[PDB]
Amino acid sequence: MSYLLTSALLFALGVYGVLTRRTAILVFLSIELMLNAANLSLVGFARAYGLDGQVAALMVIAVAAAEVAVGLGLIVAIFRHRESTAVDDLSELRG
Amino acid sequence: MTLNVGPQHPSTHGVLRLMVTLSGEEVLEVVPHIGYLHTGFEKTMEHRTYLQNITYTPRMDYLHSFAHDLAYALAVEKLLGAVVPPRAETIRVILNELSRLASHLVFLGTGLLDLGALTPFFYAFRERETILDLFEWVTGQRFHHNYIRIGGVKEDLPEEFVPELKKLLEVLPHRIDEYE
Amino acid sequence: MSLLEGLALFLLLLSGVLVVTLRNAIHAALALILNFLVLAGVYVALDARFLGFIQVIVYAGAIVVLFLFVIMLLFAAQGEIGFDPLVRSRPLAALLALGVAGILAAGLWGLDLAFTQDLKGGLPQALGPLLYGDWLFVLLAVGFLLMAATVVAVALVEPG
Amino acid sequence: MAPIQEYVGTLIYVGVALFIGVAALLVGALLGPKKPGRAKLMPYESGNDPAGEVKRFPVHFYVVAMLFILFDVEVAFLWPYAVSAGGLGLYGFLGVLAFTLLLFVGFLYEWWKGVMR
Amino acid sequence: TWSYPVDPYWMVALKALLVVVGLLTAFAFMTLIERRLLARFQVRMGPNRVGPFGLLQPLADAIKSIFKEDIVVAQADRFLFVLAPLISVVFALLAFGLIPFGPPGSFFGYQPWVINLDLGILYLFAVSELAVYGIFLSGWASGSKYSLLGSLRSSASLISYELGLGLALLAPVLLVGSLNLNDIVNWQKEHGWLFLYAFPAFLVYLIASMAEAARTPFDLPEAEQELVGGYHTEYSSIKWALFQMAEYIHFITASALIPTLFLGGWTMPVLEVPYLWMFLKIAFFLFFFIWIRATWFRLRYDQLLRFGWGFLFPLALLWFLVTALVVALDLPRTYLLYLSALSFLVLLGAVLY
Amino acid sequence: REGILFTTLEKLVAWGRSNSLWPATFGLACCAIEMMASTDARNDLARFGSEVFRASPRQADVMIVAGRLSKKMAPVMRRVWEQMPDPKWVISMGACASSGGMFNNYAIVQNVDSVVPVDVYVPGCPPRPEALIYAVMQLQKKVRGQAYNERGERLPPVAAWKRTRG
Amino acid sequence: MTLAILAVFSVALTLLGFVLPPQGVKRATLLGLALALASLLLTWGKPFAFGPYAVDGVSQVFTLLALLGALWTVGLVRSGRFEFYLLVLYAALGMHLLASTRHLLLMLVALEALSLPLYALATWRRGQGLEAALKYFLLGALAAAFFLYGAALFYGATGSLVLGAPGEGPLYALALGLLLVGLGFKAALAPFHFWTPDVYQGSPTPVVLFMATSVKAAAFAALLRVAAPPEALALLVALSVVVGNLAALAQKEAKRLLAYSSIAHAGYMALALYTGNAQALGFYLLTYVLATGLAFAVLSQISPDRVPLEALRGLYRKDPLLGLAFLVAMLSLLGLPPLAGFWGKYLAFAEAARAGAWGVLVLALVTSAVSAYYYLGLGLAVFARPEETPFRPGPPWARAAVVAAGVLLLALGLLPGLVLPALAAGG
Numbered sequence A: 001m002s003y004l005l006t007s008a009l010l011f012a013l014g015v016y017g018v019l020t021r022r023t024a025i026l027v028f029l030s031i032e033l034m035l036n037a038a039n040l041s042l043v044g045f046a047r048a049y050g051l052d053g054q055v056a057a058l059m060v061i062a063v064a065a066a067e068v069a070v071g072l073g074l075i076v077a078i079f080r081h082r083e084s085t086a087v088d089d090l091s092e093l094r095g
Numbered sequence B: 001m002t003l004n005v006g007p008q009h010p011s012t013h014g015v016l017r018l019m020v021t022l023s024g025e026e027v028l029e030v031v032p033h034i035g036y037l038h039t040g041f042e043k044t045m046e047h048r049t050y051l052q053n054i055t056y057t058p059r060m061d062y063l064h065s066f067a068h069d070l071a072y073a074l075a076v077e078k079l080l081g082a083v084v085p086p087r088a089e090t091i092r093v094i095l096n097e098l099s100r101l102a103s104h105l106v107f108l109g110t111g112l113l114d115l116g117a118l119t120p121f122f123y124a125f126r127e128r129e130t131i132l133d134l135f136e137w138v139t140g141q142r143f144h145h146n147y148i149r150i151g152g153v154k155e156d157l158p159e160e161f162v163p164e165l166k167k168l169l170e171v172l173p174h175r176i177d178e179y180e
Numbered sequence C: 001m002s003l004l005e006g007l008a009l010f011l012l013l014l015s016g017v018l019v020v021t022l023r024n025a026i027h028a029a030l031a032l033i034l035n036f037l038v039l040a041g042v043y044v045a046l047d048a049r050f051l052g053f054i055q056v057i058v059y060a061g062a063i064v065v066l067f068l069f070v071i072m073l074l075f076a077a078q079g080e081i082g083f084d085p086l087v088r089s090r091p092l093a094a095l096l097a098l099g100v101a102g103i104l105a106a107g108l109w110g111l112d113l114a115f116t117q118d119l120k121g122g123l124p125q126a127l128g129p130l131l132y133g134d135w136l137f138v139l140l141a142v143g144f145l146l147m148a149a150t151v152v153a154v155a156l157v158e159p160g
Numbered sequence D: 001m002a003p004i005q006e007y008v009g010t011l012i013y014v015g016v017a018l019f020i021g022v023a024a025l026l027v028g029a030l031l032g033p034k035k036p037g038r039a040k041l042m043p044y045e046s047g048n049d050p051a052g053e054v055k056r057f058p059v060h061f062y063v064v065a066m067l068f069i070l071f072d073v074e075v076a077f078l079w080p081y082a083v084s085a086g087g088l089g090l091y092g093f094l095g096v097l098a099f100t101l102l103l104f105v106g107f108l109y110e111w112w113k114g115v116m117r
Numbered sequence E: 001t002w003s004y005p006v007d008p009y010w011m012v013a014l015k016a017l018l019v020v021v022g023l024l025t026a027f028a029f030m031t032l033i034e035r036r037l038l039a040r041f042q043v044r045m046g047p048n049r050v051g052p053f054g055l056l057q058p059l060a061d062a063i064k065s066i067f068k069e070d071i072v073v074a075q076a077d078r079f080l081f082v083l084a085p086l087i088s089v090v091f092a093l094l095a096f097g098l099i100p101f102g103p104p105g106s107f108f109g110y111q112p113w114v115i116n117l118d119l120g121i122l123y124l125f126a127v128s129e130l131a132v133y134g135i136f137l138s139g140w141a142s143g144s145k146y147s148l149l150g151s152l153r154s155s156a157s158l159i160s161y162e163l164g165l166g167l168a169l170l171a172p173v174l175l176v177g178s179l180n181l182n183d184i185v186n187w188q189k190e191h192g193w194l195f196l197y198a199f200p201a202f203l204v205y206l207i208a209s210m211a212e213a214a215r216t217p218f219d220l221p222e223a224e225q226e227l228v229g230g231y232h233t234e235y236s237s238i239k240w241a242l243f244q245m246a247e248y249i250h251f252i253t254a255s256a257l258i259p260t261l262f263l264g265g266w267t268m269p270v271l272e273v274p275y276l277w278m279f280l281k282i283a284f285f286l287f288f289f290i291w292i293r294a295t296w297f298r299l300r301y302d303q304l305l306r307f308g309w310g311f312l313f314p315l316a317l318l319w320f321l322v323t324a325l326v327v328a329l330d331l332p333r334t335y336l337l338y339l340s341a342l343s344f345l346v347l348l349g350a351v352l353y
Numbered sequence F: 001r002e003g004i005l006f007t008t009l010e011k012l013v014a015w016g017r018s019n020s021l022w023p024a025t026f027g028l029a030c031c032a033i034e035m036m037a038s039t040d041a042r043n044d045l046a047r048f049g050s051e052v053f054r055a056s057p058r059q060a061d062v063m064i065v066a067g068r069l070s071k072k073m074a075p076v077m078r079r080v081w082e083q084m085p086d087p088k089w090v091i092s093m094g095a096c097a098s099s100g101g102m103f104n105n106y107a108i109v110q111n112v113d114s115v116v117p118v119d120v121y122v123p124g125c126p127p128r129p130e131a132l133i134y135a136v137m138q139l140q141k142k143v144r145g146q147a148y149n150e151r152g153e154r155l156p157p158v159a160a161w162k163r164t165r166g
Numbered sequence G: 001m002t003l004a005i006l007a008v009f010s011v012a013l014t015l016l017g018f019v020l021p022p023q024g025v026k027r028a029t030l031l032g033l034a035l036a037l038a039s040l041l042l043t044w045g046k047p048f049a050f051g052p053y054a055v056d057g058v059s060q061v062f063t064l065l066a067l068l069g070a071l072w073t074v075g076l077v078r079s080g081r082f083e084f085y086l087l088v089l090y091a092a093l094g095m096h097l098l099a100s101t102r103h104l105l106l107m108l109v110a111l112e113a114l115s116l117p118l119y120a121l122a123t124w125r126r127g128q129g130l131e132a133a134l135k136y137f138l139l140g141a142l143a144a145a146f147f148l149y150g151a152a153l154f155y156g157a158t159g160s161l162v163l164g165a166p167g168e169g170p171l172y173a174l175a176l177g178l179l180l181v182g183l184g185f186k187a188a189l190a191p192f193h194f195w196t197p198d199v200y201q202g203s204p205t206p207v208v209l210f211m212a213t214s215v216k217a218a219a220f221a222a223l224l225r226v227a228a229p230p231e232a233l234a235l236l237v238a239l240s241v242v243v244g245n246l247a248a249l250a251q252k253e254a255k256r257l258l259a260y261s262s263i264a265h266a267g268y269m270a271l272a273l274y275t276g277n278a279q280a281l282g283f284y285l286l287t288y289v290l291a292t293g294l295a296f297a298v299l300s301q302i303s304p305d306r307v308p309l310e311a312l313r314g315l316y317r318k319d320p321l322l323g324l325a326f327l328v329a330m331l332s333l334l335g336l337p338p339l340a341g342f343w344g345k346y347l348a349f350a351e352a353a354r355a356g357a358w359g360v361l362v363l364a365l366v367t368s369a370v371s372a373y374y375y376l377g378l379g380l381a382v383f384a385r386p387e388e389t390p391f392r393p394g395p396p397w398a399r400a401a402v403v404a405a406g407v408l409l410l411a412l413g414l415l416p417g418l419v420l421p422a423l424a425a426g427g
């Protein structure tokens, strides 16, 4: 029960992350902490309703990992040529 | 990435410096820069007599010391136009080729170690010690031996240098083969 | 419980604060490794052992290396590069963070139920029959995702 | 379940190891005189750095890493089958093979295209 | 352990402490012996003075190593510089206490393991990934970009082989049906030493635990004679000893796992007696690697990459499918014997003519 | 803490260091090739911890300056010395290094003592391998504190506080 | 199966693509989709499970659409790597899968399967198109965390991980709210809309086609299985329909204008969700897909890059048929009767009024009159003085498509009672 509250806190923290950072890769890093917040929650309930929440969690891991790989990959290919990773120095598309 | 493969280190050879123009995976250029042992023979020898010069010729190369000595000797002998008795030229080829073997042995010894792993060094060296010991007998010393004195060598071959030479001539064929 | 419990959850949260506050990518990422250990421990404690070990192996052993390689690859000496009109927005950001916990907190005092089932310790024996049982479809979905990821990833990076 | 007895015990092992580690490091750290220099301080031989602080490195390292993550997820899943494998029958084997061929298809693509750039 | 005894926590600590200091002193006198067994191979005598037979030469070495100036260079990450050796040694140390050496009830009222889990192999696998943390951090830590580039070379390589280890342990795991070291040992007692039913898994494992810094990659690198190996090269006093150390404790750990898994723990059809037969199996593989170490060259990191990544893993999963099929249709174990026997024959005629 | 105190302890530490001397070679010319000789095979050397092939200054500590040493090379060698941890000794092998040998010129740097303090000299061009063994025995017994010379004076074991590094 | 064709072709083609020339892979992939389409028609109305995969009334209709969009976009582009088809293929599968499930984990896995290749497809390496890509990925990845967090609290409130099981007090209320967020973002219901203006501008035109048809279809498909609270819906719609239509007046770059439009249409469609329907959205999206598909084909025929508003003008001179097509399209999205766009609106509105939510429905309608500013802003601009700008006319290939779409469009305008009968929700 403690754990399920804790999970929401780690989610909250990640959000504070996602909004503050000025380096793009660390944004993405923050996202990962939120994702593990999720898996904790899911797992906590897995103790309540017995054993499917495990298999659930594993599937989440794989998806998360997939989105890491592609995402950092993208970050790499965009800013290998750019010499600063400043996120708010990308601004021409705007209303 | 122009990389500075520095004086000797960290690839532990000579004292050459090489500026490696590198893309990252693809070697593009090496700019070699030399000048780390310019101790000027070309100058120094202008201030020492001809007998003395025979002692500055094996101090340049050293893996093959005697070849400089031999090369220099000839150049003078030729110049003032006086023969070399026949036995002299015989001794001189026996030593010259003996020093050549000495050089190749050190070359293959270092190379193999250089990239590659440890062992083949020691065998290539082992044989090299024997050659140096043979040399030791006849000229009184190891590499950097001075034995030419214009017109021939400066002492006879000792009694003992021929027996010991025979020993080493038996072994070498089998021995070379193990490097192959 | 709450003697030991406190320790683990304090550590976890504290570590959490660090990874979103600190300066410099390496110290940051590294904190997240301490995080995933704690979390792994907490898994083990909650009768999910298998999942625990996978937490270490994948998420903390595979993933973060990839992170580290990116932040080494392209350097990162500031977690706060440039200065730009975003400065006041630090307090509204910190506000909203509280909010998103607040509403979720509210919800969780809204269904409170028993924690009381068995799980077999979560050992991969007892997960097996389910996984390739009726979850076999979900699995093959996973498998497709990975393949797509590889191919996508290549197409972004190498020209080709 | 499985006994908790040894997991606590694991932590014990770690606690021992870390202690002996750190102890050694403090022994090492305190003894041996001090005297800074002008080129001990400024890094290695030829240039400021002996890579002279070049910018950016091949994407190779990214590729190798990326490969490793996805495929480590592969390994993760094949363990549940690996332990209890006789329980699942022929239908089991067909499932596993199916999954594997998908990830191997990945493999052959990124292989023919290049681990090298 | 659902059927085996457990230890008293104080006694865990004692056995643990013993296994640490045991592995230090182990490493010490082994290094001396490694020098010397090389020496003889390269027609020489190693340490021979520092009497009574060399036996104090390691003492001298250790004492030398400390009492030297440790200095952190300008341009280095303060925190990491200190941490980085610790990390590398911790993750080497762990998982020697996992593997049993004797049978139960024979450590004088106690058990011959530190832990024994209920998920053995995963823990093992896990520690092998975490050493590589130590490595690349050191790279950055040193703050010379030369070291960094080296350390990435290293890490990249290590991690490539890391994947093969996963598929390597699957072959005996099927057969034993549990994944705890003890069960693997007892399994072998009856049915046969596991290198028999899974010759290709012996192979792929052997050379894959080999590939951890242990020469024959070696554009690992070690600094000398190349675009340098990182990590070290900017570390001086105590810290340096630790890296070097770690690499050897790993070496010996690997020399133990290959017996534990594949040729029986201490099971024999000649005599089981607790410690001894294990120490001898260790002894063999230890000695085997040093002969390898001497007599062949080094690989490029190009080649090394082709080899594990491109070659080994297709053999590793290929073997997995075969063995999974065989077990799935629930067939006789004779059918693995024939194939094993055939693979050994394939690889024999191909090398030896 | 700094350094060492107590009669007992120092005698211990002094044995430990002294019998373990670890060479970082600084090959430079013909002198070098004979120094390699001293390792292999028939000749001894591997009996004082020098067996392993060490060749970063960081990982070792007695610098064997073996060969002629050009004007251009002085700052390089200088810097190499500076980058050694604190108890660091220089055997100076060979005449070109020791005094300048037979080269007395604009080019060559005469008497190695310019670029560092020497400790033990071993004369010859080259001195044959066995002489180098003798040199390291000298340096061994020097560091033990039994460093007296004809003038009755002892040299302090480490001389490298004799000169400065900066 | 349908799944069978996609999966098989995709995997096989993966390795295959090395041998074949890039035109040949365009040929291959076209065939593949079309076969997938074939298999769809001939198995219509037989609901078939085989796992969590479950083909039903919803699935059939929306994956018809998803496949449609995918056929078109693959048509137009000439590549330099076989991969810029391969990734699209994948993406189509991902959207197929998204519709044909009801189990939350499949839904997650599907969400990455459809979203991932989209990020990469945002790159023809045009500098804008990297800025675009990034925004989308980070915002997407944020939503990934949200939708995943949503699922985790859902499992808490109910034993099922499938959608369906009673529903509870607060927690169930909570969980359902965070799920609408994820899904919301993919369909661009405000106030998650933020990426839709930048990405539509930044990405290369044919790609944008694909997003503006397929992702909207797919997104709605899965959305429909969510039993969304009537309050949530009301919020979303208001924000979508107001911000969408008003802001769109300010814009003057063609694609970005259409982006804002594509917020508004999502807003109207989300009305249908009240009582839930699959006939209403079936029809609606049919008219929307055709119209946008037509329209963006035309924009491509203008130029590959950012199309200034003026560039449209003179389209009738350049070719008559094509010029008229685009007109019909623009009127259709405004919904001027008797065009099919009107019926699409009407059916959706009818479900709102049954549900009794009055206010929303009024607001929607008022601002739907606003929409006529910019729609005519395009549609009439067509006829004026011809511009001197880049253009090309394309093959008979494209002519047939565009003009097919425009006839097909107004055909359903007069006879909606053809399709509507058999867009059954049960078979």
Ligand code: SF4
Pocket (backbone or CB within 6 Å): B059, F029, F030, F031, F066, F067, F068, F094, F095, F096, F097, F101, F124, F125, F126, F127
């Ligand atoms: S002293 Fe002699 S052996 Fe040495 S570098 Fe000089 S010439 Fe060579």
